[PDB]
PDB file of all heavy atoms in Angstrom:
ATOM      1  N   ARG C 158     110.498 -53.951  20.326  1.00 39.19           N
ATOM      2  CA  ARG C 158     110.799 -55.355  20.093  1.00 39.19           C
ATOM      3  C   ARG C 158     111.361 -55.558  18.699  1.00 39.19           C
ATOM      4  O   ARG C 158     112.399 -56.208  18.525  1.00 39.19           O
ATOM      5  CB  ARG C 158     109.548 -56.204  20.308  1.00 39.19           C
ATOM      6  CG  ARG C 158     109.689 -57.675  19.899  1.00 39.19           C
ATOM      7  CD  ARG C 158     108.451 -58.486  20.295  1.00 39.19           C
ATOM      8  NE  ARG C 158     108.492 -59.875  19.838  1.00 39.19           N
ATOM      9  CZ  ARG C 158     107.791 -60.334  18.807  1.00 39.19           C
ATOM     10  NH1 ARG C 158     106.987 -59.519  18.148  1.00 39.19           N
ATOM     11  NH2 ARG C 158     107.871 -61.605  18.444  1.00 39.19           N
ATOM     12  N   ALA C 159     110.708 -54.976  17.699  1.00 32.58           N
ATOM     13  CA  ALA C 159     111.164 -55.164  16.329  1.00 32.58           C
ATOM     14  C   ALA C 159     112.568 -54.616  16.150  1.00 32.58           C
ATOM     15  O   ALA C 159     113.416 -55.247  15.512  1.00 32.58           O
ATOM     16  CB  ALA C 159     110.196 -54.506  15.354  1.00 32.58           C
ATOM     17  N   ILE C 160     112.834 -53.443  16.715  1.00 34.16           N
ATOM     18  CA  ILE C 160     114.144 -52.822  16.592  1.00 34.16           C
ATOM     19  C   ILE C 160     115.167 -53.748  17.207  1.00 34.16           C
ATOM     20  O   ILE C 160     116.257 -53.936  16.665  1.00 34.16           O
ATOM     21  CB  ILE C 160     114.212 -51.453  17.279  1.00 34.16           C
ATOM     22  CG1 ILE C 160     113.136 -50.547  16.738  1.00 34.16           C
ATOM     23  CG2 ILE C 160     115.547 -50.814  17.007  1.00 34.16           C
ATOM     24  CD1 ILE C 160     113.264 -50.353  15.313  1.00 34.16           C
ATOM     25  N   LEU C 161     114.836 -54.304  18.365  1.00 34.20           N
ATOM     26  CA  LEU C 161     115.771 -55.198  19.014  1.00 34.20           C
ATOM     27  C   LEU C 161     116.073 -56.392  18.129  1.00 34.20           C
ATOM     28  O   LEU C 161     117.238 -56.789  17.988  1.00 34.20           O
ATOM     29  CB  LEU C 161     115.203 -55.641  20.354  1.00 34.20           C
ATOM     30  CG  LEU C 161     116.299 -56.164  21.259  1.00 34.20           C
ATOM     31  CD1 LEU C 161     117.272 -55.047  21.510  1.00 34.20           C
ATOM     32  CD2 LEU C 161     115.721 -56.673  22.551  1.00 34.20           C
ATOM     33  N   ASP C 162     115.039 -56.952  17.501  1.00 34.77           N
ATOM     34  CA  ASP C 162     115.240 -58.045  16.560  1.00 34.77           C
ATOM     35  C   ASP C 162     116.217 -57.640  15.473  1.00 34.77           C
ATOM     36  O   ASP C 162     117.133 -58.391  15.124  1.00 34.77           O
ATOM     37  CB  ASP C 162     113.909 -58.444  15.933  1.00 34.77           C
ATOM     38  CG  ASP C 162     112.807 -58.541  16.935  1.00 34.77           C
ATOM     39  OD1 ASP C 162     113.092 -58.875  18.097  1.00 34.77           O
ATOM     40  OD2 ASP C 162     111.649 -58.251  16.565  1.00 34.77           O
ATOM     41  N   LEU C 163     116.012 -56.456  14.911  1.00 37.52           N
ATOM     42  CA  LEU C 163     116.824 -55.983  13.803  1.00 37.52           C
ATOM     43  C   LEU C 163     118.266 -55.834  14.247  1.00 37.52           C
ATOM     44  O   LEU C 163     119.205 -56.223  13.543  1.00 37.52           O
ATOM     45  CB  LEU C 163     116.248 -54.660  13.301  1.00 37.52           C
ATOM     46  CG  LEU C 163     116.431 -54.291  11.843  1.00 37.52           C
ATOM     47  CD1 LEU C 163     115.975 -55.427  10.981  1.00 37.52           C
ATOM     48  CD2 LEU C 163     115.576 -53.091  11.554  1.00 37.52           C
ATOM     49  N   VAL C 164     118.441 -55.304  15.455  1.00 40.21           N
ATOM     50  CA  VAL C 164     119.775 -55.153  16.021  1.00 40.21           C
ATOM     51  C   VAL C 164     120.467 -56.499  16.060  1.00 40.21           C
ATOM     52  O   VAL C 164     121.602 -56.661  15.599  1.00 40.21           O
ATOM     53  CB  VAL C 164     119.697 -54.560  17.434  1.00 40.21           C
ATOM     54  CG1 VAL C 164     121.069 -54.573  18.065  1.00 40.21           C
ATOM     55  CG2 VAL C 164     119.149 -53.175  17.380  1.00 40.21           C
ATOM     56  N   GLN C 165     119.775 -57.488  16.611  1.00 43.18           N
ATOM     57  CA  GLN C 165     120.394 -58.792  16.776  1.00 43.18           C
ATOM     58  C   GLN C 165     120.660 -59.453  15.437  1.00 43.18           C
ATOM     59  O   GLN C 165     121.682 -60.123  15.272  1.00 43.18           O
ATOM     60  CB  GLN C 165     119.508 -59.656  17.667  1.00 43.18           C
ATOM     61  CG  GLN C 165     120.234 -60.770  18.377  1.00 43.18           C
ATOM     62  CD  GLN C 165     119.364 -61.424  19.425  1.00 43.18           C
ATOM     63  OE1 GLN C 165     118.187 -61.088  19.565  1.00 43.18           O
ATOM     64  NE2 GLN C 165     119.942 -62.351  20.179  1.00 43.18           N
ATOM     65  N   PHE C 166     119.771 -59.259  14.471  1.00 43.73           N
ATOM     66  CA  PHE C 166     119.970 -59.843  13.157  1.00 43.73           C
ATOM     67  C   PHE C 166     121.236 -59.286  12.533  1.00 43.73           C
ATOM     68  O   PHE C 166     122.030 -60.027  11.951  1.00 43.73           O
ATOM     69  CB  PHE C 166     118.771 -59.543  12.273  1.00 43.73           C
ATOM     70  CG  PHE C 166     119.024 -59.775  10.829  1.00 43.73           C
ATOM     71  CD1 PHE C 166     119.065 -61.051  10.330  1.00 43.73           C
ATOM     72  CD2 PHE C 166     119.300 -58.732   9.989  1.00 43.73           C
ATOM     73  CE1 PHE C 166     119.303 -61.271   9.007  1.00 43.73           C
ATOM     74  CE2 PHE C 166     119.567 -58.952   8.672  1.00 43.73           C
ATOM     75  CZ  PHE C 166     119.558 -60.221   8.175  1.00 43.73           C
ATOM     76  N   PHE C 167     121.442 -57.977  12.653  1.00 41.26           N
ATOM     77  CA  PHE C 167     122.717 -57.430  12.216  1.00 41.26           C
ATOM     78  C   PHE C 167     123.861 -57.846  13.113  1.00 41.26           C
ATOM     79  O   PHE C 167     125.016 -57.694  12.712  1.00 41.26           O
ATOM     80  CB  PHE C 167     122.684 -55.906  12.162  1.00 41.26           C
ATOM     81  CG  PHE C 167     121.927 -55.360  11.004  1.00 41.26           C
ATOM     82  CD1 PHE C 167     121.601 -54.025  10.954  1.00 41.26           C
ATOM     83  CD2 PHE C 167     121.564 -56.168   9.955  1.00 41.26           C
ATOM     84  CE1 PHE C 167     120.913 -53.512   9.886  1.00 41.26           C
ATOM     85  CE2 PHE C 167     120.866 -55.659   8.890  1.00 41.26           C
ATOM     86  CZ  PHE C 167     120.544 -54.330   8.854  1.00 41.26           C
ATOM     87  N   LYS C 168     123.569 -58.345  14.312  1.00 38.37           N
ATOM     88  CA  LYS C 168     124.592 -58.791  15.254  1.00 38.37           C
ATOM     89  C   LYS C 168     125.487 -57.652  15.715  1.00 38.37           C
ATOM     90  O   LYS C 168     126.711 -57.789  15.742  1.00 38.37           O
ATOM     91  CB  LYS C 168     125.453 -59.902  14.649  1.00 38.37           C
ATOM     92  CG  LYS C 168     124.675 -61.068  14.110  1.00 38.37           C
ATOM     93  CD  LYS C 168     125.614 -62.021  13.399  1.00 38.37           C
ATOM     94  CE  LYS C 168     124.881 -63.235  12.874  1.00 38.37           C
ATOM     95  NZ  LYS C 168     123.849 -62.843  11.874  1.00 38.37           N
ATOM     96  N   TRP C 169     124.908 -56.513  16.074  1.00 41.55           N
ATOM     97  CA  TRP C 169     125.731 -55.416  16.552  1.00 41.55           C
ATOM     98  C   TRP C 169     126.249 -55.676  17.956  1.00 41.55           C
ATOM     99  O   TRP C 169     125.602 -56.343  18.764  1.00 41.55           O
ATOM    100  CB  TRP C 169     124.954 -54.113  16.515  1.00 41.55           C
ATOM    101  CG  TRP C 169     124.762 -53.665  15.146  1.00 41.55           C
ATOM    102  CD1 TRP C 169     125.223 -54.271  14.028  1.00 41.55           C
ATOM    103  CD2 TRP C 169     124.094 -52.487  14.724  1.00 41.55           C
ATOM    104  NE1 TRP C 169     124.861 -53.554  12.922  1.00 41.55           N
ATOM    105  CE2 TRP C 169     124.164 -52.450  13.327  1.00 41.55           C
ATOM    106  CE3 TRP C 169     123.428 -51.464  15.389  1.00 41.55           C
ATOM    107  CZ2 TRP C 169     123.597 -51.440  12.588  1.00 41.55           C
ATOM    108  CZ3 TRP C 169     122.868 -50.468  14.658  1.00 41.55           C
ATOM    109  CH2 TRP C 169     122.963 -50.453  13.271  1.00 41.55           C
ATOM    110  N   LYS C 170     127.428 -55.135  18.241  1.00 43.87           N
ATOM    111  CA  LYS C 170     128.115 -55.370  19.499  1.00 43.87           C
ATOM    112  C   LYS C 170     128.416 -54.067  20.218  1.00 43.87           C
ATOM    113  O   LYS C 170     129.176 -54.040  21.187  1.00 43.87           O
ATOM    114  CB  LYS C 170     129.393 -56.155  19.240  1.00 43.87           C
ATOM    115  CG  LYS C 170     129.112 -57.508  18.638  1.00 43.87           C
ATOM    116  CD  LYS C 170     130.362 -58.345  18.517  1.00 43.87           C
ATOM    117  CE  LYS C 170     130.023 -59.743  18.040  1.00 43.87           C
ATOM    118  NZ  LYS C 170     131.223 -60.619  18.004  1.00 43.87           N
TER     119      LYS C 170
END
Side-chain angles (χ1 to χ4, degrees):
Chain C
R158 172 173 176 256
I160 304 301
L161 200 62
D162 316 329
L163 209 52
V164 173
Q165 204 170 4
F166 165 75
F167 285 168
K168 307 174 178 62
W169 288 358
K170 298 186 174 184

